[PDB]
UniProtKB/Swiss-Prot annotation, chain A:
GO terms for biological process: photosynthetic electron transport in photosystem II. It comes from Rhodopseudomonas palustris (strain ATCC BAA-98 / CGA009). The gene is pufL. Its main location: membrane. GO terms for molecular function: bacteriochlorophyll binding; electron transporter, transferring electrons within the cyclic electron transport pathway of photosynthesis activity; metal ion binding. A ubiquinone binds at F216. PROSITE patterns: REACTION_CENTER. Gene3D superfamilies: Photosystem II protein D1-like. The lineage of its organism: Bacteria, Pseudomonadati, Pseudomonadota, Alphaproteobacteria, Hyphomicrobiales. The reaction center is a membrane-bound complex that mediates the initial photochemical event in the electron transfer process of photosynthesis. This is Reaction center protein L chain.
Length: 276, 46, 306, 48, 247, 46, 48, 45, 48, 48, 46, 46, 48, 47, 47
């Protein structure tokens, strides 16, 4: 159950709550108390989705959907059969995500490494909370959250997008898309570079970081380095999600639900340098 | 007021000053040319 | 333990590095080289030198021919006024040919300039691909970077060349403009059903999301174990130290499985390459094969008849 | 000292700088007088 | 595949992609198992047959090195399978407890790997991790703090020593280590830069991993102008142990 | 008060001060020019 | 003395800076008087 | 004489030339955009 | 001695620079006289 | 005129000249083929 | 005439020449195929 | 006037001059081809 | 020199290159004669 | 300063000036021809 | 400074001029043929 080098690391200690009661492994998985909690939350959420599906018309995987409450309930609690299942699944999902992050923190403490991974997961948790909690509250009702369906939340995305003219003109949306595409480009570059240094041409020895610096100084004239590329990767991947959360916060709560993003940019066309 | 030159390198102060002055002159000329009362090329409109 | 590795504390400065000597068959590099204090806070401070030969110079020349065509058409569409050009620069474009000309060579003001700019941009991009391959080979390294670039090139060709061919018209291509090409994206999605129901579009989005996920994970992991010498990914594979052991054990105790110091970069390569590949397949299928993706989704049980 | 200039250089550079600045200012003043004689600005609340 | 039939080209293409993706996932999980296999069985399990999982580990791989030598992975000699640990319980999945001193035994967060006892040689057969006094042409960019002279404090405010040198990485120019002279010993130890906060108190270097009085126990280098990979890994593990055992 | 320069760098702070004041002035001028009462080129708008 | 200057240089720069800032403020005050004379602001609750 | 002991003639000349060319292009384009000073097609409408 | 030139080289370069500058301005003045002879600008507030 | 070959390398110049000439030639051919009067393959476009 | 090969590397020249010739041929063929008169497959459009 | 060549490398200066002149010529030809009066191919418009 | 080729190597390469080039030109000319026999180009200002 | 003597710069400048002058002559001839083909600079009313 | 001798410089110049002249001659012939196929430079009213 342990890797050939793992035994010297499976020491006791480094927990947050629970002491040494939950300080064991089940196969490869560390447990802790947050592992028990997150598996519990996940299983309750899955059972609730299955129960909501049994009450529906189909078992088709692509058509399962847990719909948010109706707008007539405001920010209150809806009946279980008419919107409350969505609220409880949201609660369970949030709990599962928070407990997953805390279990990662415990693993980091036991291993003695930095806490960058749970910190980076907190950004995705923040985006989810912005989508299901913050924006629906600023708008007024839980009916603004997206459904839990493989192909119905895409319909939610498209309806929300067309509710603001053309969503492409959202400036934070543009910045987030730029960051996403740059993240993809940089991941491809880094993967290919390390692979080409470790698997060189036929009959060559394994290369060195000097070759890695040289190839990109020859291609584009600059190289960022081995720690710089990882810093930049984290930075880009987190900035994309930060700006997408900002993009969704200002749409609806700031710009009205019947407005248009193309017409915002007219602030540039009406500058007195060229307006009359 | 000659003291400032012991602190500021003229070979960059003058470049910054010239670029800024040119940008300002361009902006003011464009503003004037976009009006109708002060358009000195096509004249007033309507 | 309290120092996060985001910014360099103290910077070391030495002489500039000329570079690994090139395999015979290449020109000499340049000699101009400088250092930047801010670039050294996050990464490396040396800037340059650059290598320019035949492929790079020809790539730049063709790309600038195309850029000049686009810009001169944008100035002509605004009556050569620089004030009105600056006023609305993101709203200008060089439109694709008109639908009444098929795949012929149209008049200049109805699609000829667009076709010439596309041709020269395509030659430029192909020359840059050749340059990446050549620069990688001149050092004895592999060619994984150029074969990752080929996938983006393939998506570009599908968007601009292959799908218009299979549709039999140059008008199916995007314009050369900032906001106009976003409008073209919107109208393309609207014209062929709903692009959300194209399964290869879904796969491409999944691979973009997974690319962001994996690159965040890898960056955070390498920064977390950098105190034990984890950023030297090549030496940690030929001689495994404790940094990569801790990195693997973190993800093994978290999600059950892990990678090595090399295989994670294969995961990276493949998740990055599979986005434009699936995208190109989905774009080639849209129009020539399927013309309404929502009807396809209804036929295969993706959505109720609605 | 810090800009790499000695006192004498700094002082004579200041002198030529002030002279050129003054010529620029007087030319601008003439230009503005001419511009006002062509088309005055600063109207009244009811217009021109 | 005819017009009107249920089967069409798009879904055929999709299933082709699904098969290709299953194959690619198998290939990737196969490449993932080039280190740490076969597994070590837990307590109360049979040890007659090896555990490898369903994607079987591939054949060993050989890398050609610069001088002409080779390197075959997996690196089975880096594992250190016999250490000073005792199980805290007889059932499977139980944690281990150090029997002696975890700072000197190399267990837990203070664990190191059995690397090669030679320095990394760089592209000209000269060590790359080098004191600044032995790297001709490199300096410390006076815009940043000069650690040479600052005292070093532990996690408890006690001063452990002073900074006398900065060890840099050639071919990747960076400060990698600080040389610390212990308070009352005239002996030199190394401190990894990622473990230190230069200028956290205005004229000091703060290390919150070990107590100020533990710098005397940091492992030392054989030669005063170069460090091997094993020594680097040991010096890193010593500071890593304090994150859990400094108390 | 002169000790601020023992705390800040004159050549690094004075440039930011100049940029700040210029941006503030250009913004105020544009805002006034965009109104109808305080427009001083074309005057009020009917 | 961490900015790289001495006390005397600091006093020099501070004196010149104060006089320049004061001249700027005086010119601005005159400009505001003239601007108010051309067209006043701060209307009454009913408007101008 | 002016003291060129401060500005390298090479850079101060190449920048001056690029600047003058840009200014001239801008002025010619501004004039061409008008209907009164268009010297190729003439007045419009 | 900052630029890298001597003090006589500076005088020579400056003389040539002034001659070229003046030739340029003379040609420009002739160009503007001809341009005004083709189309006058600066209309009156009524128009042309 | 032969002396110029002490400034420029014959290889670089001769290899850039051919590229320049081919680019110019294909651009001219494309411009001609876009028009209706100088199209030599299909001839003049059918007048609407 | 042979002197050209004292300036040019024959391998590089042949690679460049072969790629250029193939590209030019394929371009001319495509242009011809796009027209109505010189289409040798399906002939003229009505 | 020949003194200029002590300051400028004739190689770089001459290649920049050639590039500049070719670009200017291309721009002028484009502007002319874009009009109706001076279009020498296909002649005036209507 | 630049190419690092013996003059004899240069003449050998030149001979074989010219033979190949001439064969290519011959077959291309035959192809063009056959193509003109199939369909002529260069129409008149009115068409074919 | 650049890498030239005082005489080779002289002869280079001479050749440069002759080339420039002949280029200007050809341009002047082209402009005469172009004015004979299609004049520019119309009147305020048009052509 | 180009790494060239003087005799080889003059030889290169001679061959360059001869081939340049051949190119120019072929181009002029092609342009005569093109003009007798289709004249350009129409009149201000059209062809
Ligand atoms: C529609 C929904 C779609 C999404 C569905 C998502 C489902 C998520 C399921 C999550 C749980 C999976 C658990 C698998 C455990 C397998 C055994 C194991 O440890 O393997 C280790 C092995 C790694 O080590 P190895 O060297 O390869 O093998 C070692 C040996 O296994 C030998 O190792 P050992 O000696 O340590 O022994 C291991 C053994 C320990 O010995 C025991 O007997 C332990 C006692 C428990 C035994 C039974 C465990 C559970 C068996 C499988 C149950 C599956 C269902 C779980 C509930 C699902 C509810 C929905 O078992 C365990 O440790 C079990 C741990 C969990 C309990 O494999 C993994 O870690 C695999 C990780 C997989 C993660 C989940 C991936 C899910 C798919 C993701 C993509 C989904 C896309 C969907 C798209 C849909 C359309 C858009
Ligand atoms: C109507 C037509 C019908 C046709 C017949 C039917 C269809 C046939 C399709 C054939 C497809 C290609 C087959 C050969 C591929 C060879 C790849 C190779 O050798 O990779 C070595 C490579 C390992 O190389 P290494 O050890 O890292 O480095 C070796 C040297 O040190 C370094 O050596 P190096 O530096 O020389 O090479 C670096 C390496 C780098 O790695 C790669 O390139 C491999 C990935 C290839 C990606 C290709 C992207 C293509 C993008 C679009 C095309 C280009 C457009 C633009 C062109 C340029 C424009 C300017 O690149 C290569 O070795 C391959 C170069 C050529 C790539 C493109 C091939 C097409 O293999 C892998 O990494 C794994 C490959 C994936 C295996 C996945 C598991 C099996 C997947 C299939 C499962 C079942 C599917 C069932 C489907 C449904 C059936 C019903
Ligand atoms: C009116 C139209 C006529 C016609 C009129 C003419 C005329 C006129 C000519 C030809 C000529 C040719 N015709 Mg024809 N031809 C017609 C129809 C065809 C068809 C077809 C299936 O319809 C084909 C295959 C051809 C093929 C050919 C070639 C034999 C020849 C082109 C020379 C060449 O390509 O240089 C290529 C030479 C090389 C050395 C290229 C080497 C390859 C390089 C090194 C590798 C490149 C790698 C590449 C980028 C990889 C990707 C490629 C893709 C995978 C495809 N013709 C029709 C019937 N044809 C020409 C000729 O005869 O010349 C001898 C010629 O003058
Ligand atoms: C017509 C529709 C509009 C449009 C309307 C919208 C709307 C509405 C939204 C976006 C959003 C996005 N759009 Mg948009 N958008 C359009 C066109 C585009 C185009 C394009 C090429 O045209 C692109 C590239 C994008 C890209 C983007 C991104 C900026 C953003 C999605 C990333 C994100 O939200 O991360 C966020 C990531 C998460 C939330 C992941 C959460 C992770 C959680 C915590 C983990 C879950 C684990 C799971 C439950 C358990 C799995 C375990 C299993 C065992 C595996 N849009 C069109 C024009 N777009 C979204 C956005 O910005 O929201 C912030 C959004 O809401
Ligand atoms: C309303 C609009 C539609 C929509 C319409 C389209 C269309 C159309 C397309 C996509 C495509 C994609 N969409 Mg979408 N998309 C929508 C909603 C989304 C949402 C969302 C949350 O709603 C997201 C995250 C996405 C995201 C995606 C990606 C998965 C995919 C883009 C891949 C890529 O990286 O291309 C970026 C990379 C390239 C384009 C290749 C780059 C080419 C080369 C390498 C660059 C050369 C640059 C050159 C040198 C620069 C100089 C040039 C000159 C200056 C001109 N879409 C909605 C439903 N989407 C693309 C796709 O492939 O899907 C099938 C695509 O064609
Ligand atoms: C895995 C898919 C992703 C991807 C991958 C990818 N892109 C790549 C590569 C790879 C693997 C390269 O190797 C190549 C590269 O050089 O990267 C540094 C490149 C590249 N991807 C680029 C852009 C790009 N990639 C995009 C997308 C993506 N690229 C995908 C998301 C996009 C989007 C989202 O629209 C853009 C705009 C370029 C930066 C570069 C290819 C440059 C090129 O072809 O240049 C042609 C030349 C011209 C057009 C002439 C004009 C000059 C510039 C406008 C071009 C850029 C030049 C500059 C990059 C270098 C200049 C150096 C100088 C010293 C000469
Ligand atoms: C009126 O309009 C116009 C515009 O205004 C609207 C313009 O503004 C401009 C542009 C000019 C400017 C104003 C900008 C300034 C730019 C310059 C001064 C440069 C001038 C440029 C030209 C006059 C033309 C430029 C052309 C170039 C650089 C080469 C063009 C080459 C091709 C088009 C290739 C031919 C097509 C083929 C063969 C198709 C094949 C398919 C591919 C995509 C692959 C191509 C690959 C190769 C052929 C090379 C392969 C090489 C390899 C393998 C390497 C071998 C090894 C080596 C190292 C050699 C012009 C010209 C114009 O007119
Ligand atoms: C969409 O679906 C839906 C859910 O959503 C998934 C919902 O839920 C709910 C129900 C929710 C409500 C009725 C209230 C929702 C209101 C808001 C979200 C408004 C915004 C609120 C905030 C800004 C604060 C948010 C905090 C909340 C509400 C957490 C809930 C708290 C409890 C259940 C009590 C137990 C305490 C917990 C788990 C956290 C307490 C909250 C905090 C903010 C803690 C703050 C922590 C710190 C300040 C630092 C902590 C320091 C530590 C850990 C010390 C470490 C040790 C050291 C020594 C350093 C509905 C109806 C819903 O339909
Ligand atoms: C007959 C055959 C043989 C020829 C065809 C050969 C084929 C192969 C061609 C196929 C072409 C396809 C493939 C390409 C399709 C393109 C799409 C895929 C993508 C569109 C690009 C989207 C961008 C956002 C464009 C913006 C560009 C613009 C904003 C820049 C303008 C620059 C100006 C300002 C220049 C500065 C101002 C001055 C005057 C100095 O210049
Ligand atoms: Fe990495």
């Amino acid at each position: 159950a342990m890797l050939s080098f793992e035994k010297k690391y499976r020491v006791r200690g480094g927990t947050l709550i629970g002491g040494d009661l939950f300080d064991f492994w089940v196969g490869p998985f560390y447990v802790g108390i947050f592992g028990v909690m997150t598996v519990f939350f996940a299983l309750i959420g899955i059972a609730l989705i299955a129960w909501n599906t049994a009450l529906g018309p189909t078992w088709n995987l692509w058509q399962i959907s847990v719909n948010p409450p109706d707008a007539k309930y405001g920010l209150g609690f809806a009946p279980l059969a008419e919107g409350g299942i969505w609220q409880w699944v949201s609660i369970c999902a949030t709990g599962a995500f928070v407990t997953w992050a805390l279990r990662e923190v415990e693993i980091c403490r036991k291993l003695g490494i930095g806490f960058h991974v749970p910190f980076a997961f907190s950004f995705a948790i923040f985006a989810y909370v912005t989508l299901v909690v913050i924006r629906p509250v600023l708008m007024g009702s839980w009916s603004y959250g997206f459904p839990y369906g493989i192909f119905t939340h895409l319909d939610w995305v498209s309806n929300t997008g067309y509710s603001y003219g053309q969503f492409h003109y959202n400036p934070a949306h543009m910045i987030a898309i730029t960051f996403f595409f740059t993240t993809c480009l940089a991941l491809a570059l880094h993967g290919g570079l390390v692979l080409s240094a470790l698997n060189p041409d036929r009959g060559e020895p394994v290369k060195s970081p000097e070759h890695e610096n040289t190839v990109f100084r020859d291609l584009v004239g600059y190289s960022i380095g081995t720690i710089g590329i990882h810093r930049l990767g984290l930075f880009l991947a987190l900035s994309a999600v930060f700006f997408s959360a900002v993009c969704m916060i200002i749409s609806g709560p700031v710009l009205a639900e019947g407005g248009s993003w193309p017409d915002w940019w007219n602030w540039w066309r009406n500058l007195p340098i060229w307006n009359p | 007021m000659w003291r400032i030159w012991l602190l500021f390198d003229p070979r960059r102060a003058l470049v910054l000053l010239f670029v800024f002055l040119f940008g300002l002159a361009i902006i003011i000329h464009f503003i004037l040319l976009s009006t109708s009362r002060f358009n000195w090329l096509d004249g007033p409109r309507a | 333990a309290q120092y996060q590795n985001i910014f360099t504390q103290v910077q070391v400065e030495g002489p500039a590095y000329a570079g690994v000597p090139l395999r015979p068959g290449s020109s000499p590099r340049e000699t101009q080289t400088t250092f930047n204090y801010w670039l050294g806070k996050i990464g490396d401070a040396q800037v340059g030198p650059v290598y320019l030969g035949f492929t790079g110079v020809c790539s730049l020349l063709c790309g600038f021919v195309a850029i000049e065509i686009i810009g001169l058409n944008m100035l002509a569409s605004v009556d050569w006024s620089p004030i009105e050009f600056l006023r609305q620069f993101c709203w200008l474009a060089l439109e694709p040919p008109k639908p009444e000309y098929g795949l012929t060579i149209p008049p200049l003001k109805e699609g000829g300039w667009w076709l010439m700019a596309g041709f020269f941009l395509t030659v430029s991009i192909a020359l840059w691909w050749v340059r990446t391959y050549r620069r990688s080979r001149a050092l004895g390294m592999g060619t994984h970077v150029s074969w990752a670039f080929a996938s983006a090139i393939l998506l570009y060709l599908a968007l601009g060349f292959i799908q218009p061919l299979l549709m039999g018209s140059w008008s199916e291509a995007p314009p050369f403009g900032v906001f106009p090409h976003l409008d073209w994206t919107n109208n393309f999605s609207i014209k062929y059903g709903n692009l959300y129901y194209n399964p290869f579009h879904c796969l491409s989005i999944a691979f973009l999301y997974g690319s962001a996920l994996l690159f965040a994970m890898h960056g955070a992991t390498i920064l977390a174990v950098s105190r034990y010498g984890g950023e030297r990914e090549i030496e940690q594979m030929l001689d495994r130290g404790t940094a990569l052991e801790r990195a693997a054990l973190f993800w093994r105790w978290t999600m059950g499985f892990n990678a090595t110091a090399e295989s994670i970069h294969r995961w990276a390569w493949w998740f990055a390459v599979l986005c434009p590949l699936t995208g190109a397949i989905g774009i080639i299928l849209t129009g020539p094969v399927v013309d309404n993706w929502f009807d396809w989704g209804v036929k295969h049980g993706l959505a109720p008849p609605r | 000292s810090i800009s790499g200039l000695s006192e004498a250089e700094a002082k004579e550079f200041h002198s030529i700088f002030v002279t050129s600045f003054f010529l620029f200012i007087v030319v601008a003043v003439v230009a503005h007088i001419l511009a006002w004689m062509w088309r005055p600005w600063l109207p009244k609340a009811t217009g021109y | 595949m005819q017009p009107g039939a249920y089967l069409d080209l798009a879904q055929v293409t999709l299933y082709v992609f699904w098969i290709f993706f299953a194959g690619l996932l198998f290939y990737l999980r196969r490449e993932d198992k080039r280190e740490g296999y076969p597994l070590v069985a837990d307590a109360g399990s049979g040890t007659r047959l090896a555990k490898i999982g369903v994607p079987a580990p591939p054949d060993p791989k050989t890398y050609l090195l610069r001088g002409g030598a080779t390197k075959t992975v997996p690196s089975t000699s880096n594992d250190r399978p016999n250490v000073a640990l005792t199980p805290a319980a007889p059932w499977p999945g139980a944690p281990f407890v150090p029997t002696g001193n975890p700072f000197a035994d190399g267990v837990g967060p203070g664990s190191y790997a059995q690397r090669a006892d030679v320095p990394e040689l760089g592209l000209d057969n000269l060590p790359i991790i080098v004191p600044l006094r032995a790297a001709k042409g490199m300096f410390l960019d006076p815009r940043d703090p000069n650690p040479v002279g600052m005292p070093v404090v532990g996690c408890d405010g006690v001063v452990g020593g002073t900074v006398t040198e900065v060890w840099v990485d050639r071919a990747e120019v960076l400060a990698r280590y600080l040389e610390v002279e212990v308070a009352k010993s005239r002996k030199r130890v190394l401190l990894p830069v990622p473990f230190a906060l230069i200028n956290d108190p205005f004229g000091k270097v703060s290390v919150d991993a070990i107590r100020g009085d533990q710098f005397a126990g940091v492992p030392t280098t054989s030669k005063g102008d170069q460090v091997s990979k094993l020594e680097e890994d040991k010096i890193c593990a010593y500071y890593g142990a304090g994150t859990l055992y400094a108390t």
